[PDB]
């Protein structure tokens, strides 16, 4: 189900009534009604303040035996109202009918009545006011706009190519700005023979940490304080092997470290994985992760101690900045930290590493919806010693 928010109607007035009061339209009762005789008469609903509205619902007196003509108008003052919908009721139901229009800011909503099939009465039994289907929109045009330092990363695409100079790059099919112009999207489709990427290799659209001037790949150590914060949603998984890696700390394979600490989603299972189980056992974050749920995550390394913070409440960045973030730690038994280990040659990765390919998807390879996807609203990293 798409999400549909319902605004409370705090008051209602009208140009006219015959003793069937305007309040009768919001009492949840099908046997009470508003009535006013004459084309042009209207009822006006008040939401208390201005809200984004894109749907009005009405149920009509004799809604299943006659049709009613009307128009809807919206705005912040009752003399500043602009028309957004006009038409006729269906004549086939006594329940709510949905009338939807361009989302518009309004405090007041007015239905104007033009009589009905039989006579000039306007009569309404129920009315509701809605936004039908959540981060504030932005002004991003290209993915580099969402990066605070566009020099500090390089991207690796699913076609096997790389870009070390992301400042100014255009939106592409693997890395682009979402609709609301507030996030970057890392899309990793599953296809056979995609550029130089082997069919048996897994598929990434993801950032690798660089020096802040972009001169080269950066390597750091577990000594000192090192942080990655990401606000993101995992929005899609492949069809057969619905497995995907988002945020990561990486060291050398040669040292038995490799992908030391990563966030992984398998189905609804969201967990942290430590060199794929070779350092320590997977640690579960959530068993019921729903695709498209915006979360925040921090990996924090302090002289070898690895801490995991997770939140779906929107407040993790604010809390970490205010110093009150302990509430969001993912604890492991009776330890505040999920792992203690020292290594060097370490760097961060952010984005989408989809753990599937053409061999695992087989016949569903090339399918339109056979891709992994990660939407990143915000992120930062810090280093200290
Ligand atoms: Ca009623
Ligand atoms: K470039």
CA-wise closest residue to 156 among 211, 183, 192, 196: 196
Residue 16 lies in a domain: yes
Q: How far is the CA of 54 from the centre of ligand 1 (A)?
A: 22
Whether 100 and 52 map to the same domain: the answer is yes
Whether 100 and 238 map to the same domain: the answer is no
Neighbours of 345 (CB within 10 A): 13
Q: How far is the CA of 346 from the centre of ligand 2 (A)?
A: 25
Torsion sign, CA atoms 368, 370, 375, 379: negative
Q: How far apart are CA 153 and CA 184, in angstroms?
A: 14
Q: How far is the CA of 96 from the centre of ligand 1 (A)?
A: 11
- Determine contact, residues 230/296, Cβ cutoff 8 Å: yes
Torsion sign, CA atoms 152, 156, 162, 167: negative
Boundaries of domain holding 125: 5-131
Experimentally, how was this structure solved? Answer: X-ray
Residue 136 lies in a domain: no
Q: How far apart are CA 127 and CA 54, in angstroms?
A: 14
Of the residues 97, 131, 165, which one is the last residue of a structural domain?
Answer: 131
One-letter-per-residue 3-state SS of the chain: CCCCEEECCCEEEECCCCCCCHHHHHCCCCCCCEEEECCCCEEEEEEEEEEEEEEEEEEECCCCCCCEEEEEEEECCCCCCEEEEEEECCCCCCCCEEEEEEEEEEEEEEEEEEEECCCCEEEEEEEEEEECCCCCCCCCCCHHHHCCCCCCEEEECCCCCEECCCCCCCCCCCEEECCCCCCEEEEEECCCCECCECCCCCEEEEEEEECCCCCCECCECCCCEEEEEEEEEEEECCCCCCEEEEEEEECCHHHCCCCCEEEEEECCEEEEECCCCCCCCCEEEECCCCCCCEEEEEEEEECCEEEEEEECCCCHHHHHHHCCCHHHECCECCECCCEECCCCCEEEEEEEEECCCHHHHHHHCCCCCCEEEEEEEEEEEEEEC
Whether 369 and 267 map to the same domain: the answer is yes
Whether 96 and 149 map to the same domain: the answer is no
User: What is the total count of domains within the chain?
Assistant: 2
Of the residues 103, 131, 159, which one is the last residue of a structural domain?
Answer: 131
Residue 107 lies in a domain: yes
Q: How far is the CA of 84 from the centre of ligand 1 (A)?
A: 24
Whether 120 and 150 map to the same domain: the answer is no
Q: How far is the CA of 31 from the centre of ligand 1 (A)?
A: 6
Shortest-distance ligand to the CA of residue 32: 1
Whether 336 and 187 map to the same domain: the answer is yes
Torsion sign, CA atoms 15, 21, 23, 27: negative
**The pair of three-digit structure tokens given for residue 195, joined into one six-digit string:** 């550029």
Q: How far is the CA of 42 from the centre of ligand 2 (A)?
A: 59
Residue 172 lies in a domain: yes
Q: How far apart are CA 292 and CA 349, in angstroms?
A: 21
Shortest-distance ligand to the CA of residue 214: 2
Strand partners, 283: 272
Cα–Cα–Cα angle for 318, 273, 305, rounded to 5 degrees: 60
CA dihedral 309, 310, 315, 319 (to 10 degrees): -10
Of the residues 131, 165, 182, which one is the last residue of a structural domain?
Answer: 131
What's the length of the chain?
A: 385
92 phi/psi in degrees, rounded to 5: -125, -5
Q: How far is the CA of 320 from the centre of ligand 1 (A)?
A: 49
CA-wise closest residue to 273 among 243, 293, 303: 243
Residue 229 lies in a domain: yes
Q: How far is the CA of 126 from the centre of ligand 1 (A)?
A: 5
Whether 99 and 152 map to the same domain: the answer is no
Q: How far apart are CA 233 and CA 384, in angstroms?
A: 28
Distances (CA, A) of 185 to 171, 266, 352: 10, 19, 9
- How would you class 195 by CB atoms within 10 Å of its CB: exposed for 0-12, middle for 13-18, buried for 19 or more? exposed
Residue 228 lies in a domain: yes
Whether 153 and 92 map to the same domain: the answer is no
Q: What is the CATH number of the domain that holds 323?
A: 2.60.120.200
Shortest-distance ligand to the CA of residue 150: 2
Q: How far apart are CA 303 and CA 319, in angstroms?
A: 22
Q: What is the CATH number of the domain that holds 26?
A: 2.60.120.260
- How would you class 14 by CB atoms within 10 Å of its CB: exposed for 0-12, middle for 13-18, buried for 19 or more? buried
CA-wise closest residue to 158 among 359, 355, 364, 376: 355
Q: How far is the CA of 33 from the centre of ligand 1 (A)?
A: 5
Shortest-distance ligand to the CA of residue 154: 2
Q: How far is the CA of 215 from the centre of ligand 1 (A)?
A: 69
Q: How far is the CA of 14 from the centre of ligand 2 (A)?
A: 61
**The pair of three-digit structure tokens given for residue 352, joined into one six-digit string:** 């989408």
Å resolution of this model? 2.3
Whether 299 and 197 map to the same domain: the answer is yes
Half-sphere exposure of 365 (CA within 13 A, CB side): 15
Whether 196 and 315 map to the same domain: the answer is yes
Ramachandran area for residue 275 (φ above 0: left; ψ -120 to 50: alpha; else beta): left
Q: How far is the CA of 167 from the centre of ligand 2 (A)?
A: 7
Residue 137 lies in a domain: no
Whether 115 and 193 map to the same domain: the answer is no
Whether 171 and 290 map to the same domain: the answer is yes
Q: How far is the CA of 249 from the centre of ligand 2 (A)?
A: 25
Residue 76 lies in a domain: yes
Shortest-distance ligand to the CA of residue 22: 1
Shortest-distance ligand to the CA of residue 59: 1
**The pair of three-digit structure tokens given for residue 229, joined into one six-digit string:** 């914060």
Q: How far apart are CA 202 and CA 385, in angstroms?
A: 35
């Amino acid at each position: 189900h798409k999400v549909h928010m319902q605004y409370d109607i705090v008051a209602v007035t009208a140009s006219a009534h015959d003793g069937n009061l305007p309040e009768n339209t919001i009492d949840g009762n099908l046997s009470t009604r508003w009535s006013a005789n004459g084309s042009g008469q209207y009822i006006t609903f008040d939401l208390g303040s201005a809200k984004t509205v894109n749907q009005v619902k009405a149920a009509w007196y004799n809604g299943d035996s006659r049709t009613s003509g009307f128009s809807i108008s919206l705005g912040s003052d009752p003399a500043s109202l602009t028309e957004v919908y006009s038409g006729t009721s269906s004549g086939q139901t006594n329940a709510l009918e949905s009338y939807s229009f361009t989302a518009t800011t309004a405090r007041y909503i007015r239905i104007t009545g033009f009589g009905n099939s039989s006579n000039t009465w306007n009569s309404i039994t129920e009315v509701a006011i809605f936004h039908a289907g959540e981060e504030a929109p932005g002004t991003a045009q290209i993915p580099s706009d969402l990066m605070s330092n566009c020099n500090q990363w390089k991207i690796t695409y699913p076609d096997g190519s790389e870009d070390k100079t992301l400042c100014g790059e255009a939106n592409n099919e693997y890395w682009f700005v979402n609709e609301d112009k507030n996030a970057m999207v890392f899309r990793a489709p599953i296809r056979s023979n995609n550029g130089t990427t082997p069919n048996s290799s897994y598929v990434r659209s993801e950032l690798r940490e660089r020096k802040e001037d972009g001169s080269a790949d950066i390597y750091w150590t577990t000594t000192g304080t090192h942080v990655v914060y990401v606000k993101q949603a995992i929005t899609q998984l492949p069809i057969v092997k619905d497995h995907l890696v988002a945020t990561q700390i990486h060291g050398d394979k040669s040292a038995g470290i490799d992908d030391a600490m990563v966030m992984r989603l398998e189905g609804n299972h969201l967990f942290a994985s430590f060199n794929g189980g070779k350092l320590r056992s997977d640690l579960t974050i959530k068993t019921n992760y729903n695709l498209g749920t915006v979360h925040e995550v921090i990996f924090e390394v302090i002289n070898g101690k690895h801490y995991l913070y997770y939140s779906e409440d929107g407040k993790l960045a604010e809390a970490y900045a205010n110093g009150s973030a302990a509430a969001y730690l993912i604890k492991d038994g009776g330890n505040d930290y999920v792992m203690d280990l020292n290594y060097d040659q370490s760097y961060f990765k952010i984005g989408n590493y989809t753990q599937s390919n053409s061999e695992k998807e087989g016949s569903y390879t090339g399918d339109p919806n056979n891709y992994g996807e990660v939407v990143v609203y915000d992120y930062f990293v810090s280093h200290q010693h």
